[PDB]
């Protein structure tokens, strides 16, 4: 996160750390959607141009964390993965279309003050909240600049109109993506950055006061550049695939 601020304790309890066993390293963000399921960006697992291909065995998940580097001795829960599922039409070859993956935890986690799942949007919630101008919230432990924070970072960013998104890059945008950030004119800034992928883009419903995951941190070009925007996987749109895997496994 660039131009964000230190989260408050318990602010984003669905926030998960994607952790490499050896070398020990922060890989990405992720989010807790149930006591057994974690959502993340498929490119955190699989990205062949960079020779990245991780397996169940390559990783750990750390839940209820605040500090990046400290072992949060009676707060955080570390869990092993049982199974990784990547969207079958995830497009690593061209544009990260469908950048989404599910991780099934070995044993379920116990929810606490620091551990709690986020809601998945419904057709109706998506419809009302996913509008240009409406702000969402991004969290993560990624780069502070185009570096590593000591505590979880947060930033509030507005959704941007499709055409503006399109005109900002040479990358082919698809309906499975949305962009967000401030316009240079708006002179307010901030963005996700490398190490932030898989982190949730969340909105708070004004109807029922619940937090919903609308996005997943996917890609960008640079971090917090004027005229550029963060791109996110559109969760509602990949909803049936998510349902489909949980209903099957």
């Amino acid at each position: 996160i660039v131009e964000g601020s230190d989260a408050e304790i318990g602010m984003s309890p669905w926030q998960v750390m994607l952790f490499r066993k050896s070398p020990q390293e922060l890989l990405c963000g992720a989010s807790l959607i149930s006591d057994r399921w974690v959502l993340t960006a498929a490119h955190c697992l699989l990205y062949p141009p960079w020779d990245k291909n991780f397996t169940e065995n390559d990783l750990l998940v750390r839940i209820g964390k605040h500090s990046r580097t400290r072992y949060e001795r009676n707060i955080e829960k570390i869990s092993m993965l049982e199974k990784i599922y990547i969207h079958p039409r995830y497009n690593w070859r061209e544009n990260l279309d469908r950048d989404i993956a599910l991780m099934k935890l070995k044993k379920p986690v116990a929810f606490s003050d620091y551990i709690h799942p986020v809601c998945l949007p419904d057709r109706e919630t998506a419809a009302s909240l996913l509008q240009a101008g409406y702000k969402g919230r991004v969290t993560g432990w990624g780069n502070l600049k185009e570096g590593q924070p000591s505590v979880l970072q947060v930033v509030n960013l507005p959704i941007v109109e499709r055409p503006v998104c399109k005109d900002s890059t040479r990358i082919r945008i698809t309906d499975n993506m949305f962009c967000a950030g401030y316009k240079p004119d708006e002179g307010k800034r901030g963005d996700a950055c490398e190490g932030d992928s898989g982190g949730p883009f969340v909105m708070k419903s004004p109807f029922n006061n619940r937090w919903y995951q609308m996005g997943i941190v996917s890609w960008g070009e640079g971090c917090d550049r004027d005229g550029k925007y963060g791109f996110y996987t559109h969760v509602f749109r990949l909803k049936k695939w998510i349902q489909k895997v949980i209903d099957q496994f």
Partner: peptide
């Protein structure tokens, strides 16, 4: 600077 578990 990761503290072991």
């Amino acid at each position: 600077k990761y503290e072991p578990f």
